[PDB]
């Protein structure tokens, strides 16, 4: 579970960059006080929603 | 006021590598210069007289900035730190640690209780001046940050980056309130009244934006700027000018409203990375890179 | 050699751009029109607000005085002109006929006729006594930017974005002269000189030109100001030195020596495009008016 | 910088002006149908309308 | 020991009598209020109009700035005060409570409080941050003509047609001093000295007086002007030489030497009662305003 602010940031970045580097996800997780695994997992799941084709 | 007549009054030598920034002190008495030679130098604003050398940074400095009372400086360096300096004593009062790569840009807010920094590590940091502690780290960009600047009352921060974004931030909360959107954004700053934003992109273009409406109001061209992050200025002391340096070694001056080039200042022998306008007098300072290593002072009648 | 016009009055009543300012022939009053649908009357020497005239349903682009300074005519985006009694502020008649915006208007010296120009590409001549339209001239193939009578009212000059200036015989409605120039710039303003032998025309290439319309010869060109987007009034100043006076899109009032073509004074003070200027009939006083970011009239005074 | 009468026919300009006098703002769909009728390009018609709305002005 | 104020600009626009003029503490703006229900914002000395503030339903008798120049408060015959954000022109809050015209208003130096006097014979203290009335003082036995905070805001002075000047402790609202001149002539205006040790009182017998309100002793008397019918502001001028400034019912601005009580300049120009004057915080500049037959604001600059 993420806070309102934390989700706000994640979605903001996702809108600007669908794929973050390994370094960027680590850096970003520290800034938001999230684990690296939480951030990477959030981006992976975010890329899976709302598909019209594979 | 049709055209100004800036003329070379002084050439300030001393730096051993490229100069990276020049800033007049808000009291108009001093000019400060930063250099890849790891040094900050203080010069007499009106006579160009060398005053003192401030040392301490372990690597090159990209940017230096005055406090509102003119008694403090802040520097951003390749040793990943910012330093706060007491100008009179030259001593380092605080070393701001937290960025994970080069710090590129820095600025006090008007109250001068805060410092905003921007870094190659793609973030923007907000620091408490009194304690030297980092209050906030904005995940601002996804490429190196080129510029950071507070608005007239300090409620807003604008940031620019190689990632092509210019972003407006709520100082208090750290939330992003606007993105103006692609070419890299090399410099950015608020107009003196805080209504406008001046932005430099690496397609040889400067633009005056209204961030409220998100419309481009003015576009200035003629100069060369495809590689370096060159400051631009609002000259308000006499005529209403826009002042920028150029990669063809000249200082360009446009009339804010007609967008027309009114003057080009010849004298530097390398890219002019930084320009500054005196706070009360028609005086321009400019600084060039390694094939030059000098600061130049120009004066105009309007 | 030069005038010395200095700011003496700022007049701020209109809540939108001021479109036009005219001095009464007797020199006592100034009338302003505005996009806010109002006409305002001001004392010409004291700046004193006098009166608000209302009635138009959309913005007003022009206003003009009758010779006796007792009547006004205005031109509105509501496709009408209106004849007003200045003393009571009452509308005496609404001149209906134009099928689009009416942009410019003027009485003849006798003030029994009104000329009007419109976005409907026609010039219309109206009977001041009855209110009825007397003639409809298919004058131009684009909006009519200005209409002016000459000294004795036998001639009308009209101007248009079609690039033409046309001289018209008032009595018959026929066209004595069409004036055309290189690269057909839109003509944004025109007026006869006070002696009636010349014509002063502004084109949207930052240029005013003095023409002998009889020979079609351009005698004088004036540059230095900015005029690419708006229909800006210009004037002959005769009370002191002989000047040409105009507004400009750089928020300045420009004054030229008519004979030498040189800028002799630039008046700074407005915060938007100066769309209108007017020269007092007997004193060295200039009125100027600016657009949405300014909204005010200014009166300036000079010793010559 | 040259007059549109050097690229458009007189029949085309009279037809454009006829519409402009009736409405100065045409929908994207109406501009496309008009361009079709006049044998002009959609861009040409859209440009012509934009420029026509900008002509005779006392204020913004 | 003589100023040399000369007319620079005249500002017109209000459609009824102008009631008040005040310079912003930061020296950048002039505010005018009028019986036409409007507040107008002008540049301090550039002749340039900034905006019109609207919302009161009857005429406004007074307006005042906050210490940061960002806020205005206005007093109106609609029985309310309104707090305005100057930049947006927005009404932040309507202060309701008085039972009749609100005649006078002022921020305290901290600008967390607003004091108001009213025709209802009371004085009210309002919390700037919330808009709530904090205290209602039964200040007088006649309409309240002026209210003012001292330099540290610990004291308020009020004046009334009952002929009294009263000193009030801000924190407790208790009356600390009742001052009355010989005969109890109506007190039409009052304010503290900048040093806060004195009080400057206008009385409708053509007199201004400087009082040591603690000792109850009269220190200076200023006469020569006409003041019998209207509540006319008065000022300490402190940027050049130390003057007293006031309007006068003979259409002049009077300037006295504070020490010698002698008249050192009279300003001619206005054509009706000069109801209001203000002194610029840092420049030797004066603004004046006048009643119905004038309706204009004038700016004057002196070398000292």
UniProtKB/Swiss-Prot annotation, chain A:
Tissues showing expression: Not expressed in oocytes and spermatogonia (at protein level). Not expressed in many somatic organs, ovary, testis, fibroblast and hematopoietic cell lines.
Subunit and interaction comment: Interacts with SMAD1. Interacts with SALL4. Interacts with ZNF281/ZFP281. Interacts with PCGF1. Interacts with ESRRB; reciprocally modulates their transcriptional activities. Interacts with NSD2.
Protein name: Homeobox protein NANOG
Localization of this protein: Nucleus
Effect of substituting residue 40 to A: Decreased protein stability
Induction: By the transcription factor POU5F1 in ES cells that acts as a direct biphasic regulator: a steady-state concentration of POU5F1 up-regulated its expression, while an elevated concentration of POU5F1 down-regulated its expression. Up-regulated by the transcription factor FOXD3. Up-regulated in ES cells by transcription factors T (Brachyury) and STAT3. Down-regulated by p53 in response to DNA damage induced by ultraviolet light (UV) or doxorubicin. Down-regulated upon ES differentiation by mediating autorepression through interaction with ZNF281/ZFP281.
Observed phenotype of the null mutant: Loss of pluripotency in both ICM and ES cells and differentiated into extraembryonic (parietal and visceral) endoderm lineage.
Residues annotated to bind DNA: 1-54
Family: Belongs to the Nanog homeobox family.
Transmembrane parts of this sequence: none
Region Sufficient for interaction with SALL4: start-end pairs: 1-54
Effect in UniProt of substituting residue 45 to A: No effect on protein stability. Decreased embryonic stem cell self-renewal
Superkingdom of source: Eukaryota
Impact noted for substituting residue 51 to A: Decreased protein expression and stability
Gene: Nanog
From Swiss-Prot, chains C, E:
Crosslink position(s): Glycyl lysine isopeptide (Lys-Gly) (interchain with G-Cter in SUMO2): 16
Residues the record lists as N6-acetyllysine modifications: 82
TM annotation in the entry: none
One biological process term in Gene Ontology: gluconeogenesis
Tissues where this protein is expressed: Expressed in liver (at protein level). Detected in brain, testis and kidney.
Record-marked site positions (Important for interaction with histone H3): 77, 103, 233, 292
Alphabetical list of SMART domains matching this protein: WD40 (SM00320)
UniProt keyword annotations, A-Z: Acetylation, Chromatin regulator, Isopeptide bond, Nucleus, Repeat, Transcription, Transcription regulation, Ubl conjugation, WD repeat
UniProt repeat feature WD, residue ranges: 13-52, 55-96, 98-138, 139-178, 182-223, 226-266, 269-303
PROSITE patterns in the record: WD_REPEATS_1, WD_REPEATS_2, WD_REPEATS_REGION
InterPro entries cross-referenced by the UniProt entry: G-protein_beta_WD-40_rep, WD40/YVTN_repeat-like_dom_sf, WD40_repeat_CS, WD40_repeat_dom_sf, WD40_rpt
Source organism, top-level taxon: Eukaryota
Task performed by this protein: Contributes to histone modification. May position the N-terminus of histone H3 for efficient trimethylation at 'Lys-4'. As part of the MLL1/MLL complex it is involved in methylation and dimethylation at 'Lys-4' of histone H3. H3 'Lys-4' methylation represents a specific tag for epigenetic transcriptional activation. As part of the NSL complex it may be involved in acetylation of nucleosomal histone H4 on several lysine residues. May regulate osteoblasts differentiation.
Family affiliation: Belongs to the WD repeat WDR5/wds family.
PANTHER family, sorted: WD REPEAT-CONTAINING PROTEIN 5 (PTHR22847:SF560), WD40 REPEAT PROTEIN (PTHR22847)
Protein name: WD repeat-containing protein 5
Organism from which the protein derives: Mus musculus
Lineage of the organism: Eukaryota, Metazoa, Chordata, Craniata, Vertebrata
Gene from which this protein is expressed: Wdr5
